[PDB]
Amino acid sequence: GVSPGELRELTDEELAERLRESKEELFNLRFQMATGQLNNNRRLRTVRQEIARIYTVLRERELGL
RNA sequence: AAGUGUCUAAGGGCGCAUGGUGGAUGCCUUGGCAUCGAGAGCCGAUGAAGGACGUGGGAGGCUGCGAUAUGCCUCGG
Ligand SMILES: [Mg+2]
Numbered sequence: 001g002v003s004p005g006e007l008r009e010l011t012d013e014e015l016a017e018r019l020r021e022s023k024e025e026l027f028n029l030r031f032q033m034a035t036g037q038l039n040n041n042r043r044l045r046t047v048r049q050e051i052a053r054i055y056t057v058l059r060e061r062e063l064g065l
Numbered sequence: 066a067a068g069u070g071u072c073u074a075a076g077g078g079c080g081c082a083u084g085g086u087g088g089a090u091g092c093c094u095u096g097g098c099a100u101c102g103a104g105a106g107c108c109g110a111u112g113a114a115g116g117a118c119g120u121g122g123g124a125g126g127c128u129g130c131g132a133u134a135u136g137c138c139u140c141g142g
């Protein structure tokens with residue numbers, strides 16, 4: 001997935017857009033898993049973890065980075 | 066003629082032989098019991114103890130966790 005090291009340079013708005021597009025990817029992966037066209041089922045966990053990473057970066061930024 | 070004279074088993078008893086059931090005995094153990102030697106002696110409105118519901122690629126329970134959900138970041142091993 002995406003590294004915290006390569007996430008700690010995006011400012012606030014690139015972070016907010018990465019978050020939104022990652023959520024969109026997770027939505028699409030959920031529908032593909034439901035309809036049976038997903039092969040690599042390890043993608044769900046990866047996308048969830050990168051979303052959690054983006055929240056972690058934003059929260060630590062707004063509380064004394 | 067008179068007399069003597071067995072055998073058999075519908076079933077049963079006792080003894081063997083050969084099986085079945087059952088789980089005693091023997092020997093164990095990821096479990097307990099009683100202490101001894103050091104700790105630490107409180108937790109909570111900054112929301113506790115304890116829970117309900119959720120959370121995994123596949124059903125449920127335990128266990129971990131909380132919509133960031135068997136996990137996120139950093140520092141060590
Ligand atoms: Mg007889």
Ligand SMILES: [Mg+2]
Nearest residue numbers: 074075076077
């Ligand atoms: Mg007979």
Ligand SMILES: [Mg+2]
Nearest residue numbers: 139140141142
């Ligand atoms: Mg390390």
